[PDB]
């Protein structure tokens, strides 16, 4: 679904493109174009990452949710970005400041459930009992029940 | 042929004690892995222990 359709948006042109390409290394030709699973490890070394044995295994463990036995495409990019954080730039901390201080509504230098659904809903998304408290649950690396503006620009680096 | 079929048996034996100690290197390197993760969980949960302690 729209993890997969995210992780494509965020990949730049002159890294998709060797990601596919190394990544096709998982079908031997005139196969069924499977791409296996086994395979990981191999193109996350090709792609520039350098895990040891037990990353590469993990990267296995954490793909083929419908015991298929392959990988896909758009899933590759999902799981490299869980490994190698290959985002398409990334922003900056001017960037994610200037718009900290829009959810900031109050001016108190964090971000509280009441501004994070706020801010949510404005967008036409549908916002239920659980959301915003998930999210707030994310940001929040020292569970003080809100994002704060540091754990803001740990929460959203590569955010567009 | 007695140091030969030794080899041949030896050499697959030795092949065998290679596997054997590729799966006890593979098991010890998963039992590690759980031991990192048992460990890391651990680090979470005692972390968590002395955050919710302070608390």
């Known amino acids: ?160 | 042929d007695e140091s030969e079929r030794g080899m041949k048996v030896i050499e697959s034996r030795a092949q065998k004690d290679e596997e054997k100690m590729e799966i006890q290197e593979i098991q010890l390197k998963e039992a590690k892995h759980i031991a990192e993760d048992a460990d890391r969980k651990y680090e979470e949960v005692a972390r968590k222990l002395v955050i919710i302690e302070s608390d």
């Open chain 1, 1 to 160: 679904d729209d993890i997969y359709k995210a992780a494509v948006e965020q990949l730049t042109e002159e890294q998709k493109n060797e990601f596919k390409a190394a990544f096709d290394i998982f079908v031997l030709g005139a196969e069924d174009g499977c791409i296996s699973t086994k395979e990981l490890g191999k193109v996350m070394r090709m792609l520039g990452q350098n895990p040891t044995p037990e990353e590469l295994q993990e990267m296995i463990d954490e793909v083929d949710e419908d015991g298929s036995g392959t990988v896909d495409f758009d899933e590759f990019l999902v799981m490299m970005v869980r490994c190698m954080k290959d985002d398409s730039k990334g922003k900056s901390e001017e960037e994610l400041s200037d718009l900290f201080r829009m959810f900031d509504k109050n001016a108190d230098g964090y971000i509280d459930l009441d501004e994070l659904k706020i801010m949510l809903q404005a967008t036409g998304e549908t916002i239920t009992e659980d959301d915003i408290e998930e999210l707030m649950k994310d940001g929040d690396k020292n569970n003080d029940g809100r994002i704060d503006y540091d754990e803001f620009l740990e929460f959203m680096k590569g955010v567009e």
